[PDB]
Design an enzyme around this catalytic site. Sequence first.
Site, PDB file in Angstrom:
ATOM      1  N   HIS A  20       0.850  -1.180   0.000  1.00 13.59           N
ATOM      2  CA  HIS A  20       0.000   0.000   0.000  1.00 13.59           C
ATOM      3  C   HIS A  20       0.887   1.232   0.000  1.00 13.59           C
ATOM      4  CE1 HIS A  20       1.057  -0.443   4.219  1.00 13.59           C
ATOM      5  NE2 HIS A  20       0.735   0.826   4.394  1.00 13.59           N
TER       6      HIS A  20
ATOM      7  N   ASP B 227       0.748   5.041   1.839  1.00  7.44           N
ATOM      8  CA  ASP B 227       0.086   5.629   2.994  1.00  7.44           C
ATOM      9  C   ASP B 227      -0.867   6.737   2.566  1.00  7.44           C
ATOM     10  OD1 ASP B 227       1.301   3.920   4.723  1.00  7.44           O
ATOM     11  OD2 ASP B 227       2.573   5.423   5.698  1.00  7.44           O
TER      12      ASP B 227
END
Length: 330
Positions: free
Chosen positions: A213, A215
């Site tokens: 991912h 952030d």
Amino acid sequence: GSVSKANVPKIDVSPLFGDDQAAKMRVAQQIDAASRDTGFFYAVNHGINVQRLSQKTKEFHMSITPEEKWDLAIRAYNKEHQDQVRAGYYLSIPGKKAVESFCYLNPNFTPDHPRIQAKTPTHEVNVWPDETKHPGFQDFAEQYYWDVFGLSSALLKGYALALGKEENFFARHFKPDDTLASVVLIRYPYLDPYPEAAIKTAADGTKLSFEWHEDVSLITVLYQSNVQNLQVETAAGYQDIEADDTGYLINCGSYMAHLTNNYYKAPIHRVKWVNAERQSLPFFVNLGYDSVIDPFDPREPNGKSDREPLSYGDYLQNGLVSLINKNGQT
Ligand SMILES: CC(C)[C@@H](NC(=O)[C@H](CS)NC(=O)CCC[C@H](N)C(=O)O)S(=O)(=O)O
Ligand SMILES: [Fe+3]
């Protein structure tokens, strides 16, 4: 199939609290170099008592009861709490989900706050356990919010100078009266046996607790206990980020990547599965709901960018939903 180690420099950020402007530029250069390489660095000489933070967080995690967890649960775990989209307790699911956490927001978000009165999304009033059952916890948590707020403000001055701007370019949008910043007190437990259902397998075979991912933040200011787990993606694959339970691990979020035309990328990272008791305490540096930063491109002589200015609140609302959809309810 071997795994290399990321270069994560340790940057003395103490000049960012002072008035030695050349010394601050030398810090900014280090921040620039790290932001253009792997995207992570350790902030050292930061002035926060991270030992008290870890002790108080441990006392809270190891003393809260199933009754209190339901009473504090976000609406993903408790339909009675429809106002708790962000703040509250995130329950583990034994045999299925190991991680549990407690998220809180700006302590100035009260019923008196106009964003609460207007019911603006991403704004919520924090929920807290009973003071007598958890003495000093709320005081510690709120104090920590402003302690790391102070550190994050100085870090933002470093990032601003690193990009060729005046030192308040980011920090002027980072204010105690409206910041959407959050603290999450995450517990990753030791489990024997550890349920395989709580373990994910990456495309490269690595066992993970949380998938890749970027952030959702401007920057992320993270404290972790001394258990290595993080990996950052490079062109040559994922590289281990070494642990350091005395410093703060810093990285940019996707809002920074947008406003700099990807000059400071939001480093893609993931969390390896490790069967060890540990803490992960991120502070997500978010701006105000109406905060807008005009994009620019430091690669161009005129510094001009054709990207749209993004309102932070809409960015935050979209980003948090997308992260849940992609990597699951935490
Ligand atoms: C699974 C979890 C333990 C990971 N930690 C995180 O915080 C992850 C990755 S950055 N981020 C979130 O869940 C957004 C939270 C926003 C907060 N609720 C708010 O409303 O601001 S892990 O990376 O440590 O594995
Ligand atoms: Fe992250």
